[PDB]
Amino acid sequence: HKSEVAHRFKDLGEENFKALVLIAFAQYLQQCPFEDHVKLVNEVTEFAKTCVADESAENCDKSLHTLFGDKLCTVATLRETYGEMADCCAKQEPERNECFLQHKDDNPNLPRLVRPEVDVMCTAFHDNEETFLKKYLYEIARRHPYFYAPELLFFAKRYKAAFTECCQAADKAACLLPKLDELRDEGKASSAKQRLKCASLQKFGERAFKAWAVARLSQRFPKAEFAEVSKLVTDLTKVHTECCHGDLLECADDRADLAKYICENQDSISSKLKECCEKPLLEKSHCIAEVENDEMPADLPSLAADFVESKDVCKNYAEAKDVFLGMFLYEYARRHPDYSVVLLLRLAKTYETTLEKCCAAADPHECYAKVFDEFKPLVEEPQNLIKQNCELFEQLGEYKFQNALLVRYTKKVPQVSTPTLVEVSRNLGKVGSKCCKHPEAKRMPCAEDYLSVVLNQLCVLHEKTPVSDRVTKCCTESLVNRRPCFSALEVDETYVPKEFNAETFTFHADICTLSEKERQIKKQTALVELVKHKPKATKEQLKAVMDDFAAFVEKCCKADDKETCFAEEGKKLVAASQAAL
Numbered sequence: 001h002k003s004e005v006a007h008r009f010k011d012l013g014e015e016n017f018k019a020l021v022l023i024a025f026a027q028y029l030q031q032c033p034f035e036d037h038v039k040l041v042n043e044v045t046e047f048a049k050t051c052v053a054d055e056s057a058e059n060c061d062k063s064l065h066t067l068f069g070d071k072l073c074t075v076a077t078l079r080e081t082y083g084e085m086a087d088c089c090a091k092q093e094p095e096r097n098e099c100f101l102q103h104k105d106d107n108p109n110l111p112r113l114v115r116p117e118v119d120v121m122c123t124a125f126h127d128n129e130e131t132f133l134k135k136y137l138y139e140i141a142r143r144h145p146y147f148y149a150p151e152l153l154f155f156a157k158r159y160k161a162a163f164t165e166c167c168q169a170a171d172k173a174a175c176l177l178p179k180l181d182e183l184r185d186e187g188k189a190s191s192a193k194q195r196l197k198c199a200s201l202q203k204f205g206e207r208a209f210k211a212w213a214v215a216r217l218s219q220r221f222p223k224a225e226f227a228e229v230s231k232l233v234t235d236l237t238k239v240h241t242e243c244c245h246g247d248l249l250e251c252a253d254d255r256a257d258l259a260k261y262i263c264e265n266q267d268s269i270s271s272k273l274k275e276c277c278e279k280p281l282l283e284k285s286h287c288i289a290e291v292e293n294d295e296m297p298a299d300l301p302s303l304a305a306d307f308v309e310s311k312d313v314c315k316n317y318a319e320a321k322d323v324f325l326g327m328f329l330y331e332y333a334r335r336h337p338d339y340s341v342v343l344l345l346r347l348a349k350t351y352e353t354t355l356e357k358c359c360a361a362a363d364p365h366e367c368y369a370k371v372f373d374e375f376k377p378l379v380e381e382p383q384n385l386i387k388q389n390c391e392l393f394e395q396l397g398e399y400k401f402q403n404a405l406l407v408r409y410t411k412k413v414p415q416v417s418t419p420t421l422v423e424v425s426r427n428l429g430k431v432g433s434k435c436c437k438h439p440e441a442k443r444m445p446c447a448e449d450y451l452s453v454v455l456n457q458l459c460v461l462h463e464k465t466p467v468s469d470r471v472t473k474c475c476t477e478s479l480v481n482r483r484p485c486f487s488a489l490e491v492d493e494t495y496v497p498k499e500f501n502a503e504t505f506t507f508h509a510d511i512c513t514l515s516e517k518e519r520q521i522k523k524q525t526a527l528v529e530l531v532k533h534k535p536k537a538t539k540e541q542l543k544a545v546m547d548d549f550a551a552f553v554e555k556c557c558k559a560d561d562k563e564t565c566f567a568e569e570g571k572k573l574v575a576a577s578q579a580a581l
């Protein structure tokens, strides 16, 4: 790297370079229009080419940070539009780049991106593919200034793939709409995960992160020796620590350094990394992060020997407590790919707590002899919740499963906004659809990754406008206790029924023409208000009010005249429902 631009241009290729530069500027100049970004990208790209042709050509030896910051400072409208950020340009480069980092705005007032009609989108794509995808790349990037740029590039390539398939085909919308909802979903979850993982780093600390990573890595690479795992985790901590501070280039080099080290030590790590390690720089680290679990060594010993039975458990423990507990976690985790990480950390903390107690006592050995018994209830709690909830999901499917979740949660925390209860019960229900399709042995993992994001979403909303000390309690709990605290929420005995409000339970003919989704949401919103108003209501009384509403809606949308029915029979539902509750 006599010239860092030329080297990156050569490593990326022109198309990836141009996209990544568009995303990087999009995340810093969130208010400047597309055409101004197209102009920055073309200028940085002309410049890069000059350096590829001649590494000694003028300005080519400058740092990428330097070049990025100088282009920002050439934006003539910078002060008028972004203000404080323009004062970063008066700084000398080390402190300058630090100043730009603080002056991104997480979440700007930008209007929601409306999904155009399938036919408008498909024609847009066909006429000018590059500006269709790029404009929307710009639009996403500016709305998510913290999303890892190469992952956003990963999503774009999948969108593009979706249009290329679905737009020359028989029924475009029935192909394209399912692809786009899943991309939408998966993109929203990716953004929330990145956010979560940096918040968790700050809240819960470096130790907690290392434990998490030791557990996840040991499941992934069970053939790796513990020293290799601790080496990966120590470099991962650095990397994630740097990525959370937010400097794209430094994050990308750190991730590239890890991926390079991992790829150069495959045989010492995992037999599943061949295909990731053959990919170009840009995708390597992404592929490695997603790689499948290696198969565990076939005849591994019991953990009682090193952690229960040997003399010097206490000696080994006292000498390096975190190293010992790390080893316990490594050995437990590599044996249990079927466990959630968080369950593996519960188990580790149960072992820590017992060592702490037992190594003091005169006979530690008798004291901690039954620690493995303490793991039993810990393992079975999540396994049964998952049993019960998938069995329920199978009987009364996704939509009806949602309505079950919606009654449950509304009674536990009636103080929570109706939209919030609907959305999180909708989301929980989707995690049902997905994870109950896995066999038991794969389910707890599936549960964890998605529930982690549903629960953090839940807590951030609730921190913005609190409402329940109990939701606040669980939201502030240790990361291992979050979900069990929510699971220990009982029906709220304090709560005073919300008062009657007839508009809430008035429905018009508008509902039989609404989309499937919109009719479902409208019905769920009424369900919650019903429960809020009648939280004393038993199972059978709700089902009787629900089957009646369902018969009422078919009556009024099968009829020769609808609007009279959606008002006549609405009196003959609401009045009977109150009396029966």
Ligand SMILES: COc1ccc2c(c1)c(CC(=O)O)c(C)n2C(=O)c1ccc(Cl)cc1
Residues within 6 Å of the ligand: 197, 198, 220, 236, 239, 240, 243, 255, 256, 258, 259, 262, 284, 285, 286, 288, 289, 290, 291
């Ligand atoms: C192959 O090189 C890498 C590079 C970076 C990685 C990983 C692997 C893995 C995982 C793996 O190796 O399976 C993670 C998780 N990486 C992150 O940057 C990251 C993102 C969010 C958080 Cl909270 C923490 C770290």
Ligand SMILES: CCCCCCCCCCCCCCCC(=O)O
Residues within 6 Å of the ligand: 207, 208, 210, 211, 214, 230, 233, 322, 323, 325, 326, 327, 329, 345, 348, 349, 352, 478, 479, 480
């Ligand atoms: C290479 C070893 C690194 C060790 C990293 C920390 C190991 C701690 C294991 C105890 C359980 C940790 C669970 C997080 C919550 C907590 O206990 O504070």
Ligand SMILES: CCCCCCCCCCCCCCCC(=O)O
Residues within 6 Å of the ligand: 008, 020, 021, 024, 044, 064, 067, 068, 071, 150, 248, 249, 251, 252, 253, 255, 256, 259, 281, 282, 283, 284, 285, 286
């Ligand atoms: C004139 C300024 C140019 C701006 C450069 C834009 C940022 C390009 C760097 C991103 C490359 C990603 C490298 C992959 C690393 C990884 O995640 O494995």
Ligand SMILES: CCCCCCCCCCCCCCCC(=O)O
Residues within 6 Å of the ligand: 385, 409, 413, 416, 417, 420, 421, 424, 458, 459, 461, 462, 467, 471, 483, 486, 487, 489
């Ligand atoms: C604004 C705060 C939002 C809270 C909305 C309530 C949603 C239900 C929260 C409790 C359940 C979380 C999942 C725990 C698993 C279980 O059901 O046992």
